[PDB]
Subunit: 113 residues, 3 copies
């Protein structure tokens, strides 16, 4: 397992930490949403949570990443939820296909289910 | 009307406050975007705004939630904008179909329209 | 070029800064993702980054905006990544078709690629 500290930024001013595919994946529109493995695991820094979003270059090439929330204390594998929009898309292993953005976790008095 | 204080978290560390359907809704891809009623109303805590996002389990079952912004002082009903991706989707009344995340509202000098 | 200080809010409590189309654009579903020009340029205020999101009224009329990240130090043109969902959509020049939300940029020790 690899932790989020292993992710890299494109540039010092990049908001997102890039996430790569651990497998070669081919997606077609009729497949619908697929969960792609990253080999990167939570949890996140104290008092933060995450959002998974598409990289703009990847979105423009027709692979939609559905926004995902990563809880502060999630310790499982971060997966990228993705769909080929209207053409066949091919994801080569190790290609950066999404990004993790970190956001402050606001506390409230809402109850637990 | 019910306020956001009535929403619950799945777990103490969950970033999102879950939102449920007040009606049974069936969606087909050819319907396009539909606004689903939640019976939950703004406004949000001081100095915060909201984002509405899909739950990952729901996204994976083919119901796309389009990200929505909830203004700090919105006092209307929070609706979930949703679309069946490529199969028929059925939403039973009371099923959790989206989540509200709270974020800090940054002040700027931008003018009002 | 116009900076983000030129954008307006719908109301004092609106979370997003609205973004308009500089061109008339017609989109069909088979076109897939298109990058629409706004004539608005980064960079963003110190210690912030941006998210580009759809306006709810626009989403409901069948134009999907794919969420986009705007880095703090991006100095290029902010483009709106958009797709017609399942009908033909027409965007008249100057119509507000997305919004920019500003978020705190969290610093980490992650390395640069
Ligand atoms: O894109 C994503 C979204 C979520 N996740 C993981 C991390 C997150 O903390 C966890 C739960 O996310 P959601 O609350 O969106 N899913 P859901 O509500 O269906 O599951 P749960 O009931 O456990 O909260 O799923 C991903 O790995 N990728
Ligand atoms: O998913 C959503 C998105 C928005 N909303 C409500 C809350 C928000 O404050 C309000 C306005 O959101 P937008 O600014 O995204 N919509 P739009 O720009 O079309 O309307 P307005 O001109 O009033 O700002 O709509 C929802 O209930 N669900
Ligand atoms: O909707 C968007 C998304 C991004 N952008 C611009 C601003 C942002 O700082 C820049 C890079 O965004 P991403 O990191 O999402 N794209 P990508 O990873 O493909 O390019 P790079 O490798 O340069 O980071 O693209 C837009 O103008 N509109
Ligand atoms: Mg990038
Ligand atoms: Mg959940
Ligand atoms: Mg608005």
């Amino acid at each position: 397992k690899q932790p989020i500290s292993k992710l890299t930024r494109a540039t010092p001013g990049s908001a997102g930490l890039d996430l790569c595919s651990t497998s070669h994946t081919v997606l077609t529109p009729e497949m619908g949403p697929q969960a792609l493995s990253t080999g990167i695991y939570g949890p996140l820094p104290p008092n933060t949570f995450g959002l998974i979003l598409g990289r703009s270059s990847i979105t423009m090439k027709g692979l939609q990443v559905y926004p995902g929330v990563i809880d502060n204390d999630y310790t499982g594998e971060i997966k990228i939820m993705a769909k080929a929009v209207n053409n066949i898309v091919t994801v080569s292993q190790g290609n950066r296909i999404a990004q993790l953005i970190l956001l402050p976790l606001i506390e409230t008095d809402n109850k637990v289910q």
